[PDB]
Amino acid sequence: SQQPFRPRIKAQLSGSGVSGNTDFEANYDNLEILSQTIYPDAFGNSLRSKIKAY
Amino acid sequence: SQQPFRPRIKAQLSGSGVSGNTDFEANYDNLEILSQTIYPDAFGNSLRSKIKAY
């Protein structure tokens, strides 16, 4: 559809978790999603011919 | 149905009745009845574990 496209990547998961008998809720991790927006451009060229006879 | 319960007891007659051919209405006796109401109450305890691997 040549609409502006948007690709997404999943960032790698980092950050220290939880040690020992500690609740998962003491250090949540963040699922991080990055994106890009690709917009189209229009471009062109043209040749103008001379009189048919020539 | 664990609704607040009500037990009842019947007391003892203590009136002097009628003696000769005197009739019952001359001294009526009183059937006296007593009661108590028992309400419920909720209590409880709990234990929270460690991590399953521990």
- Kindly compute the dihedral angle of the four CA atoms of residues B13, B16, B22, B23, in this order, to the nearest 10 degrees: -20
Judge contact between A35 and A6, C-beta under 8 A. Answer: yes
Phi and psi dihedrals of A24, rounded to 5?
Answer: -50, -30
Q: Which residues of B touch A (CB under 8 A)?
A: 50-51, 54
User: Which of B48, B50, B51, B52 is best to mutate for the A interface (most A CBs within 10 A)?
Assistant: B51
**Backbone torsions φ then ψ of A50, nearest 5 degrees:** -90, 180
Please say whether the beta carbons of B38 and B5 come within 8 A: yes
Documented resolution in Å? 2.7
> Method used for this model?
cryo-EM
